Enzyme design. Structure first.
Site, short mmCIF file in Angstrom:
data_model
loop_
_atom_site.label_atom_id
_atom_site.label_comp_id
_atom_site.label_asym_id
_atom_site.label_seq_id
_atom_site.Cartn_x
_atom_site.Cartn_y
_atom_site.Cartn_z
N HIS A 41 4.48 26.38 -26.69
CA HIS A 41 4.90 27.62 -27.34
C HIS A 41 4.20 28.84 -26.78
O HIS A 41 4.49 29.95 -27.22
CB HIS A 41 4.74 27.54 -28.87
CG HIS A 41 3.33 27.61 -29.38
ND1 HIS A 41 2.60 28.77 -29.43
CD2 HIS A 41 2.54 26.66 -29.95
CE1 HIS A 41 1.41 28.54 -29.96
NE2 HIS A 41 1.35 27.26 -30.30
N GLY A 143 -5.15 32.63 -32.32
CA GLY A 143 -5.79 32.45 -31.04
C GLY A 143 -6.38 31.08 -30.79
O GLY A 143 -6.84 30.82 -29.67
N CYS A 145 -4.87 28.04 -30.89
CA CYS A 145 -3.99 27.01 -30.34
C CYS A 145 -4.50 26.58 -28.97
O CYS A 145 -4.99 27.39 -28.18
CB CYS A 145 -2.56 27.54 -30.24
SG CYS A 145 -1.90 28.23 -31.78
#
Ligand SMILES: O=c1[nH]cc(-c2cc(-c3cc(Cl)c(F)c(OCc4ccccc4Cl)c3)c(=O)n(-c3cccnc3)c2)c(=O)[nH]1
Lengths: 301, 305
Positions: A41, A143, A145
């Protein structure tokens, strides 16, 4: 003596964390050999989030659209491909800090350490369990991920989790390092929610044994139970059913302490019925379920 | 979101841990530049530890008595000396992994990360607080002596603790890296006990802010109170006094959250006198005092190293 929730030393994982950016999206990646792994993503815009077509978005991307940053060094992306929900970025230089590693997919109830990171930089490390509903109760801000979860065995890092998202209830969902989600979750902003969480019964029993090993006996009793009678009771408290495999996993601790597993089960039933009555067990006013039978022998004498 | 007991990443310190043996005693040393630091009780035998004369034991020892292992390599000891309760072993080669570092002495109520090691090999990392009675509630097995505690500020490791011994109740006692003990203890096999402990009040407040930040707010009430007012009730329950310094230290959390500090003290005052109902806070049925205000700010805002 003493008993803490203990994480693995994070140095070997710290040496693998990089920063990955697509347009205005920045998150973390895992740099092993000449491959950087991160959540796919990263290639979305917030307009894509509802129904992203990842294969169509990826085909439109060029190597030079991906800015990878290891410390001060920008890394040159020479190729890219997609495996399930994880993006794999080929880079022109191997990470010299690569440790011995392997990818493993863990079972609910298993524990691991999380190296929470922002902008490719480690923020902190903490110990986690995979819940029976396939979420984790992490500590994750925007932030984060691409942060990963791991165990370490001798000197080999087993990567078991990569963080992808926070559900509306405030818990966290992610994938193994082959990009397959834990649980029925998908990486798009569509309505989804985890099953009801339950207590990890075998972990709680392991923790009661640890308490006996460290000298607490105030919760033992003279009763025993059948496996089926215990599960009929425990489930009314939202505890996971106990299996014969769990009963066998507890063998060693039952031997080391001289308490049969179904004796300890009777103690657990009574604790659920009575509560702690102002007392504590290994420093908790609650029954702790994020230590595995294996962790208990690890930390304990 | 989420809130977890979180340690500093331990990479910079893992590269400094070595093994140190004297005779049949093996423990951990801290290797910075060409000096290895470890507890001076490594030179004690069975009979020695009952009532040791350390300067005499050290006199009788010589450089080759100290076996220092950095993984599979072996460090050649070229000098030895003592500072307070810490032994300094000068080696021939400097640790190439030595990080930017300094030695600091912390205050009771301050937190830090512990890298527990065995045979020079790091094994686990956890966060804990220096108790008001100058103990720490750690988790150590035999062979953990010499493990260190630290904080990281930017890129700089601040070493604040070296582990020496376990007390008979199961809590732990140690020194700073200049070998000064925390609390009224001695490195000798003799009867010792820690003073009655108390609760770090400013940390409980910080933890309540973390719960509000995370949406757990049933304990908030309409009242305010005052330091003098709060502290009369607090000391009754074995809670550390709250000082005007503590209030200003909470300002950032009050600000981020909209709950003034004296309003939050009214909530904590009530939890003391009434307890919790059947309720928990951040999944705990106890009041948590091992997070400082800075800890909460760093975790609930993403500060990295
Ligand atoms: O530049 C960057 N932009 C965005 C992020 C980011 C993105 C997500 C995320 C990713 C995907 Cl695929 C989603 F479907 C998604 O929807 C969530 C949701 C909303 C309603 C109903 C269902 C669902 Cl699931 C969110 C995220 O949860 N977090 C995030 C935030 C906090 C903690 N932990 C992680 C960060 C980032 O890290 N960096």
């Amino acid at each position: 003596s003493g008993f803490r929730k203990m994480a693995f030393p994070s140095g070997k994982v710290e040496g693998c964390m990089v920063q990955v950016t697509c347009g205005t999206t920045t998150l973390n990646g895992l740099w092993l050999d000449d491959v950087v792994y991160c959540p796919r993503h990263v290639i979305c815009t917030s307009e894509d989030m509802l129904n992203p077509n990842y294969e169509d978005l990826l085909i439109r991307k060029s190597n030079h659209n991906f800015l990878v940053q290891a410390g001060n060094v920008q890394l040159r992306v020479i190729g890219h491909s997609m495996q399930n929900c994880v993006l794999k970025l080929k880079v022109d230089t191997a990470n010299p800090k690569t440790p011995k590693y392997k990818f493993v997919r863990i079972q609910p109830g298993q524990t691991f350490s999380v190296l929470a990171c922002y902008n490719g930089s480690p923020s902190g490390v903490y110990q986690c369990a995979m819940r029976p509903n396939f979420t984790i109760k992490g500590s994750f801000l925007n932030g984060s991920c691409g942060s990963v979860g791991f165990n370490i065995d001798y000197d080999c890092v087993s990567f078991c989790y990569m963080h992808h998202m926070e559900l509306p209830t405030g818990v966290h969902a992610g994938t193994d390092l082959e990009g397959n989600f834990y649980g029925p979750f998908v990486d798009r902003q569509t309505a989804q929610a985890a099953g009801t969480d339950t207590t990890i019964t075998v972990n709680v029993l392991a923790w009661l044994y640890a308490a006996v090993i460290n000298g607490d006996r105030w919760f033992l009793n003279r009763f025993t139970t059948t496996l089926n009678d215990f599960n009929l009771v425990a489930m009314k408290y939202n505890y996971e059913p106990l299996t014969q495999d769990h009963v066998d996993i507890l063998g060693p601790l039952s031997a080391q302490t001289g308490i049969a597993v179904l004796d300890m089960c009777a103690s657990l039933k009574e604790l659920l019925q009575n509560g702690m009555n102002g007392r504590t067990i290994l420093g908790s006013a609650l029954l702790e379920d994020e230590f595995t039978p294996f962790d208990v022998v690890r930390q304990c004498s």
